[PDB]
């Protein structure tokens, strides 16, 4: 019935979030997310609960994924690139 479903809610400052930097990637079912803050979330669709959260220092700016390698590339601000399994 509902054309929209809210399955999570995140901390944000006044006005709203700054554009550009937040990223969202749907792998097969799960969804990887960053909000231009120090966290990256995994949400297991069919479950509104998160799978895991990852604290990066120096807020994330961009994400990429490899499904065959099962790898998440993440870019920090003044630090470099991390590659998590």
């Amino acid at each position: 019935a509902p054309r929209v479903r809210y399955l999570a809610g995140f901390c944000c400052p006044l006005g709203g979030l700054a554009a550009g930097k937040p990223r969202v990637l749907c792998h097969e079912a799960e969804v990887f997310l960053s909000t231009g803050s120090e966290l990256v979330y995994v949400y297991d669709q069919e479950g509104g609960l998160l799978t895991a959260a990852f604290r990066f220092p120096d807020q994330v700016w961009h994400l990429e994924l490899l499904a065959p390698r099962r790898l998440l590339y993440a870019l920090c601000a003044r630090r470099g690139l991390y590659c998590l399994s």
Partner: protein, 302 residues
């Protein structure tokens, strides 16, 4: 309401939440949750989940002080909270803070173990922080700390509070005549830190009448900053501000307003929803301050 055999409402992600104290008897009352969702076919609220939380220490006087949705400092996830006063009648009051997760499970965060009774100046802030008030002794206790800090600055009122970009946490307020730059109103970076601005808040003339404040936007030109803040007043006015410059005044129908919130509702159809103590509410337009709706008797607004 705040008592045994009384409840309180809330709202979370398009589904309403209800919290009730219900006496166990077989034993302390048990805090019961019912989250309801609008059906849209039957035009009624259907239950989709519930959740019980057990209380120990068989003493009376359980009281629901406050409830809303704030955040978790660890995860940065918006989750709803409850404050529960546990009064053993021994001039001791626990004041538990509890958080609900998406599994409809509770989590204690603050035991908070006070001696005296807490009153009017209750607020809750992003990292699960409580901010309370007696005789002009403002105090606050955070998760991540576990410690009852006192506010170093001597304030009268704390009209607004919350986090701002690059600063982390903030209280408006005052300490103790038509010039924009004077402002009479100290921002305060929490944890007894610097005032951080006394430059471009509301003028001192207005400063006597305002009884509630709600910030809409904060930009940072240099070491100073620029805030657009709505106020509302003893003389039933809704006022906008921009760099201390009063613009766009509205004259409310009813009297003695308590709070103001913002409803987006489409493309540019932005409304300020004003509540009052008279159990009524208005909705004024944005972009042209002009009253749009005048509902009445209004037990609650969401």
């Amino acid at each position: 309401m705040s008592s045994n055999e009384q409840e309180r409402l809330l709202c979370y992600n398009g589904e309403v939440l209800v919290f009730q104290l219900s006496k166990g008897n077989f034993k302390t009352p048990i805090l019961h949750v019912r989250r309801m969702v609008f059906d849209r076919g039957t035009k009624v609220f259907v239950q989709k989940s519930t959740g019980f939380f057990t209380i120990k220490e068989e003493n009376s006087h359980l009281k629901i002080m406050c409830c809303n949705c704030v955040s978790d400092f660890r995860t940065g996830i918006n989750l709803p909270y409850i404050v529960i006063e546990k009064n053993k009648k021994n001039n001791v009051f626990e004041y538990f803070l509890l958080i609900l997760h998406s599994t409809n499970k509770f989590e204690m965060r603050l035991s908070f173990k006070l001696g005296y009774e807490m009153k009017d100046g209750l607020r809750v802030l992003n990292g699960p922080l409580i901010l309370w008030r007696h005789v002009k002794a403002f105090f606050f206790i955070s998760s991540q700390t576990g410690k009852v800090v006192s506010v170093s600055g001597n304030f009268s009122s704390i009209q607004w509070a919350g986090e701002i970009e690059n600063l982390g946490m903030v209280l408006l307020g005052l300490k103790e005549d038509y010039a924009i730059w004077n402002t009479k109103f100290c921002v305060y970076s929490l944890e007894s830190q610097e005032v951080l601005s006394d430059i471009y808040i509301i003028p001192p003339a207005y400063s006597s009448v305002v009884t509630y404040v709600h910030i809409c936007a904060t930009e940072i030109i240099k070491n100073q900053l620029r805030i657009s803040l709505i106020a509302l007043t003893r003389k039933n006015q809704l006022i906008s501000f921009q760099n201390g410059t009063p613009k766009n005044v509205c004259q409310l129908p009813f009297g003695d307003p308590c709070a103001v919130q913002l409803m987006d509702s489409g493309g540019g159809n932005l409304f300020f929803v004003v509540s009052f103590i008279s159990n009524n509410a208005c909705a004024v337009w944005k972009e042209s301050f002009q009253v749009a709706a005048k509902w009445e008797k209004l037990s609650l607004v969401l």
